[PDB]
Symmetry: C3
Subunit: 245 residues, 3 copies
Amino acid sequence: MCAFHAKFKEAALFKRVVESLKSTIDKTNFDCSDAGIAVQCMDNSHVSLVSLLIETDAFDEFQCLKPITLGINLTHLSKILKALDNDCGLILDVKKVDDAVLSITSENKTMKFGLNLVDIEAESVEIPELQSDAIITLSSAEFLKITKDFSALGDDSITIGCTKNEVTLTTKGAMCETCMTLSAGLQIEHNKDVTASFALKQISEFAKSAPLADNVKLSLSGQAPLIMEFKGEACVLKFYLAPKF
Amino acid sequence: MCAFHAKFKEAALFKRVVESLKSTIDKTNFDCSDAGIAVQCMDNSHVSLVSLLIETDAFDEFQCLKPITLGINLTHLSKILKALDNDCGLILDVKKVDDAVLSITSENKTMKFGLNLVDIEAESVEIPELQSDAIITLSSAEFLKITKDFSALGDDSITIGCTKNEVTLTTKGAMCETCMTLSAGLQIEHNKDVTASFALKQISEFAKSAPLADNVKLSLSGQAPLIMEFKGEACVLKFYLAPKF
Amino acid sequence: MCAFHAKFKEAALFKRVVESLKSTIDKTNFDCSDAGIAVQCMDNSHVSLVSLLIETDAFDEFQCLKPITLGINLTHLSKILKALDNDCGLILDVKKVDDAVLSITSENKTMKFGLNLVDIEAESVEIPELQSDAIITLSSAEFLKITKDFSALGDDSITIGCTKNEVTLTTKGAMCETCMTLSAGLQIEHNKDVTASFALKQISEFAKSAPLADNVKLSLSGQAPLIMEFKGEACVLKFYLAPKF
């Protein structure tokens, strides 16, 4: 009997998950259980927090009787996933504790990969407590564009401000001071004006998770970590980043 | 009161201007006045002449009461312009003599950039006197293709010859002798047969200005500098290059 | 009188030939005769055999009264051919023994290139004798995709197995064991089950000849060299590769 078996409803979902993930962390544990697939760990720089939950509703078949944790090198997994089509039937299998995750594409073709698992020795982490001043919702693709321009024209920080009707995004580089202003497409749930600065490298790497969801949700606080959430079908991805001062 | 204010009819125009420009010169003065925006200077190699004139008809709004000269690093300006859409409403502002040109994109979005101006110490230049033997008009995109193939297959020179009904373009490389022949699409205003050789690096860099205009106009003389003109809507770009011997 | 004159029915044919060729060999002799254009030589690594035959049916005009051999640097020829459109009228000419092959594109444009020929001192080679166990036919583009994924995920070998109804392709890399399985699109002419390993570098370089033909034909034997054939209109390309043990 297999310790773990899972077939996705959509192969695109897990490919997109792994891209988004691998921009911010290289090796990570996938904690599987009868409740789904989870990832909670710090980014590469030990500066921020990543939180993934794929739910059982994302799969056509799902079996994980007892919890297991798969140590996964995301560079190796994306290389495998890049070989697949969004069309295919993607299946994951773990036989026992023999250290290999079997990925399977079904088509008149079938591809089977044995991915060697890794040993990841990592302290489990806990999300911070928050009560945000404003919650911003915006096209994730437009938000990505912005992070992109900012990386080119900015320095190390990006400032994000929110008022009742407008969001403001600021960076100042060596040869340029930039300011994008959005007015409510864009949704603002506001209860208190708020502005904060963040590491642009993180924001801009986080922003690349756009493929997971049409919109991105930024939960904004002046002193406590921001949340950038990409909620998909039966799946959600979140990043936690503390403001800079 | 602002020393300079300008809003383009089309944002594409100024983006295209700056690309074309920056292929042949890195930093240059933009001389603004109530007559428009002008650039007259030598290329990077001090081998040729660039001549730009954007007229006031290219703008929906234009104010420049007294002449000013903006010292502009084109590498920095293109990076800013690349962030904009051809769609947007592009505005330029100079407050006073505080050394920053404000670019503004209007969309439910607005982007404001402060570009630091530079000090450019350059002798003003004068265009040469000409009376050309033939004036050739041809798709600028087909002319670019040719410069491109020639750069790959040729050496340092390109020869351009004109007769009553045909234009001839020649380069000879280490492993190849190449010859393109065009017959009159292509227009020839001819009064005297003429052939001359030119630095291929220049021609091929000049040719990249194709986006400014559907056709390119080459004014050809045997002993005096060639003209390569890209005339847009209310705008024109010209290069002056002396033949080699 | 020209020693050799040829105009292709389709310019795409010779461009595709030269790309496919140049992936496996850099300089080679083109043996022309009244029977067509032929190339028989070992790959760069002196590990495999290339066999090309363009027939006279591939041309609208063809004259080669006496056999000639053109020593051709394929890097230089592809650079020339890349300048042409699939649309154009491609002509080859050799005047005498003056060491230049004239390529000509006819359009209101005409391009003439003189390509310097080379001296290639190579022992003529002979194809091996075969009687294959199975002959597999499959989309050449799907076969290329596979070689591509395998190069990324595999090591130095690829294993190809054939049964009555299924083909099996295996490679095992440092972090991955991969297996694609195809079932009969795909055609199998089978008389004996067969499996063999091959240098993946070769297969994957050979596979890039896909543009020549919709399908690829692999003639498979357990001990004797495999054949990978790309048969076009009036043209055919073949590679011969011995199994590894």
